Amino acid sequence: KPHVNVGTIGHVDHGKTTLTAALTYVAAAENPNVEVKDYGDIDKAPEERARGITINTAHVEYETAKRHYSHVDCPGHADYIKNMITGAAQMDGAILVVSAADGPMPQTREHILLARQVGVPYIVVFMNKVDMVDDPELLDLVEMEVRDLLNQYEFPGDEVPVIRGSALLALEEMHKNPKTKRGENEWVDKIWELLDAIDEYIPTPVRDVDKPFLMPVEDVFTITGRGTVATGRIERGKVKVGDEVEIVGLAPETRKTVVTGVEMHRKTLQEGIAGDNVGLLLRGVSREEVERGQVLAKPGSITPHTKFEASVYILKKEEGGRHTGFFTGYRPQFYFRTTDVTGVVRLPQGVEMVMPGDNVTFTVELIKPVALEEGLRFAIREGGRTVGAGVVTKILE
Amino acid sequence: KPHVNVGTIGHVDHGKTTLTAALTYVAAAENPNVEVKDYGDIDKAPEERARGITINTAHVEYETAKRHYSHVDCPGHADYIKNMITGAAQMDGAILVVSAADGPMPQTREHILLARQVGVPYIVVFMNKVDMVDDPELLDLVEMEVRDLLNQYEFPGDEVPVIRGSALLALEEMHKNPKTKRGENEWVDKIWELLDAIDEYIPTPVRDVDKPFLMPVEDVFTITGRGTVATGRIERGKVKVGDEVEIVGLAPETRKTVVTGVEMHRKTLQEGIAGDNVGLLLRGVSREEVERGQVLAKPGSITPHTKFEASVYILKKEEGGRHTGFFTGYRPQFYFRTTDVTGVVRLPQGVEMVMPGDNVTFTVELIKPVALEEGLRFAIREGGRTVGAGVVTKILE
Amino acid sequence: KPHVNVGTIGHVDHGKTTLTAALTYVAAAENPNVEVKDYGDIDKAPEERARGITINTAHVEYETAKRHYSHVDCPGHADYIKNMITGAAQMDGAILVVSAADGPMPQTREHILLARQVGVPYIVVFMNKVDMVDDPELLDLVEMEVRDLLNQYEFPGDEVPVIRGSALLALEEMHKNPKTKRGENEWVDKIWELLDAIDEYIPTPVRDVDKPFLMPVEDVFTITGRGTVATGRIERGKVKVGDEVEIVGLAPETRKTVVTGVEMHRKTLQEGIAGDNVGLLLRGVSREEVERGQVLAKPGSITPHTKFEASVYILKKEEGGRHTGFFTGYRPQFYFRTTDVTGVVRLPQGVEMVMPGDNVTFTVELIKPVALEEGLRFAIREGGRTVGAGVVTKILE
Ligand SMILES: Nc1nc2c(ncn2[C@@H]2O[C@H](COP(=O)(O)OP(=O)(O)O)[C@@H](O)[C@H]2O)c(=O)[nH]1
Ligand SMILES: Nc1nc2c(ncn2[C@@H]2O[C@H](COP(=O)(O)OP(=O)(O)O)[C@@H](O)[C@H]2O)c(=O)[nH]1
Ligand SMILES: Nc1nc2c(ncn2[C@@H]2O[C@H](COP(=O)(O)OP(=O)(O)O)[C@@H](O)[C@H]2O)c(=O)[nH]1
């Protein structure tokens, strides 16, 4: 029963939390396993330490016929910014909640943008609080505000599902009648539309193991009679001997070789699979030709680069980051996967100085190339300390 | 109509094959379904690839009032060694054939031993070729030679059935008169005693689903808000949620949990049954506390160990095995169910070096414990390659 | 643009063929694709071999806005009896043509009855030759003869559409003016009424893939470590693993299992779909519990039986069937789907001996049960030869 990661985003007070609890109670009915949670519990998210940052985050699990959804919900707009970016929990899709009373709001528009920068593959809307509004001209109005926003950030606003309802009401019915099921109640039934929407519109994702092969080099060693060895946990896909791969990054050019040998826990091994911390025998590679920080991957699967654009969040001083701001020309270290790689920043027009606590978008240009791809997450460091966290959003070269 | 697995064993030329063709013909008469086979067909067994080994093996099915018997027969003494050991086809009982003219012979004695190591629950004798000997002093002699051998290997030689007849003669009658039935002919009737003897003496076996629950861990996973998941095909019995089971092997100690969730083909599932490839939800178990190679089983059903005795067969080089022999201290990989577990061998007094193609018996001692039981079959590997096949014969600790 | 199957039935000379050619040319006008055919071409049907029988049958395709109709028309009353029964081509609806000059006639009445036995879902009438009769008292008379007949065989004669016209005349206008469209001409416009009638009155059919899952067992096998396998072409709907199905027929009782494995062209497969020749892995099913001749189907979708009524056609001797007639007590083999199942026949009152060439209606009673449903087509064989063809018309138990 495939597993998917979702979460509620949207402006404060629009009701992402109440809608969250409803989802549990409602789906539980047809899925007894499913552990029902209420408002207060979810409303009080725990802290979570991620990349050096703390994010109040709440989680919940619910099941449909089609799947198992683990679902996030945070208490503050800040928690959203940080979560999404450090990618504490990675949305495979997200449920966007908007007050029918207010239409989309600033955070609303912000979560859309992030969701797009950080790569959310699909957004589905749940217009809540609809019980405060009869006038369908109004409900239409809001729906439309919302779609144009989505369209502004490239979501297919024209297509997503905008389901209108009352999380508050549905939740009480689940309260009154835990055993209520489909067709029985109206408010509950909008939740079923949401849930259906989800199962339908949010793509079932690629299992890591099926994604193109990539393993990031951690250590390099020579086995006297055997040769050069790149070690590290495989991020995705798999390798079996005889497999040819590319050593990407840092070097001036990409090299190709053949795993002539996997190995783990000392013993040998026939295939290296995602999740696996192996050591591979690279064939025809000097101890120079390969180094920590490069990546090995299924050939042609990833490219090296130096100029890219990123969405970033800069730690506060209180969180252990910088204590004064910076300008274009700031040149910290960019820690990609396993190592630092210096880079110079260039703030966009309109930005003149970035401050501790901000979150912005700029370009960077690195000293050496690195196997980069959009969505590639990273850290910004000053002497080993993390001063910020970002996500790669665009390659420029 | 319960199904039982049998077959002929005994020395070369004693007539296990001719006896084989007679059982079909004879029992066909009262069971028309029954497909009659002759000597030549059975005589030419096909090869069968089992555990990396090739075994000429012949099969035949016959029915009595009481049952359905699928019956094996191999052409050579090697074939028996291999078959019995890799357990290509598992004997529920065996029919031991001995030439009345010669008495038991070397392979005769060997098969008895194997059958005992390999676990054959019952042996029943068919003394054949009796047409060559009038002297009842002789016939008794052999019978008793036979009983003492069985007694020597722990079979209840004193009690088994030693039926005296001529497979050759019964077979021709069935030939002359397919329709011949009980009471009609003498030679045929000896076959009826055999068949009766079989139905009577060979215990009717436990249906897997009825054996105590056991499932060997193949993969372990976590379902975020759900938890830990042990996957694999169920070997025996069944599981339903809330069932409590032990996690056995590898770890320093046995753990108990509760399946909190079965599941198959994505969808859910109320009960896990023998033959089924599920994924169970283990309650309160770290992703560490459970691993591939262990087994989950009905509590108190199977115990972990490291020292055991085993009867083994070593591949010839021509079959892809080792190409030189070995001594005590040999330390290959013993592949139990799903994983390799290193072990050191100790040859018994009298054996000093084992060679490719040999089949012997020795003790082993594993690096980590494993859920072992007598009868547990396994492989001996050297770099993923299978260099021998064995069966666990006794537990030492 | 859904596809539907129709055709013209009715007495000889009433003009089923001339009206057939008109539909092409008329509908063509608004559907350029549509291939126009004339009288002579449709008049000269080719043979078709169906169930061993030869049927002169003519085909034609035309399009309305609403659909795609493939449309049959045969030359002789025999052709109709044969066709309808062996169901060479299955009518989703039929267009019944009657001469306004003569009213319904014997074949007219015959066709209604068959269409009812054979299961035609809707009849729509086209009263033709109307140009030979001014007196509306007459035209009303015929129409009413017609409706009473349909009412006699359970069609809703009171409701169906009785469209009055001249196929011959519409056809010449289309001839004169291929481009003639609606409103332009009167005779053509009557054809438009027929076409609308059809699109409206004849219910839109179920695509096979959407009908309930059913697959008829052709062979049964065992995959040693996997278990039992039923193979054969899926007749309707689809199967995906984890799907539960019922094994129906032959056995004394219906069993339920789960496909635990589909498979085709050696490779595996995620879903088994109508048309596909798979092999299914039945879970928990003995090699006895399943056999050729039964069907696997969506649970509760079809039931086993032994007594049924049927409309049948008996081959002439010249066509290779019996060379003498038979009485009640006749007990041939009823070849349902894949196998023969013996049955005894009982001629109805009034019928005393059936002869080669006859087509009649009687009851049968099978030795073992079979997954039967009205509409189920079958063959009557004598030693492998087909001596007749029929259709199941009613279940009696
Ligand atoms: N009228 C109305 N009020 C709602 C509905 N959903 C939630 N509310 C309330 O709106 C407030 C915001 O709820 P909340 O879920 O906590 O939103 P969050 O800030 O996005 O976490 C709470 O007081 C809820 O009781 C609803 O459908 N209709
Ligand atoms: N006289 C006699 N010879 C027999 C009888 N059974 C088998 N034979 C012969 O024994 C020889 C070996 O028979 P077979 O069944 O092949 O022995 P197996 O190699 O143990 O299979 C053949 O030539 C048979 O004809 C019997 O009951 N009496
Ligand atoms: N008067 C008149 N004759 C017609 C009409 N339609 C058909 N005919 C003639 O009917 C005769 C037999 O018709 P046909 O279409 O072959 O019918 P089928 O016997 O059902 O195959 C032919 O000579 C046609 O030309 C019509 O509408 N009016």
Ligand SMILES: [Mg+2]
């Ligand atoms: Mg909240």
Ligand SMILES: [Mg+2]
């Ligand atoms: Mg033999």
Ligand SMILES: [Mg+2]
């Ligand atoms: Mg015609």
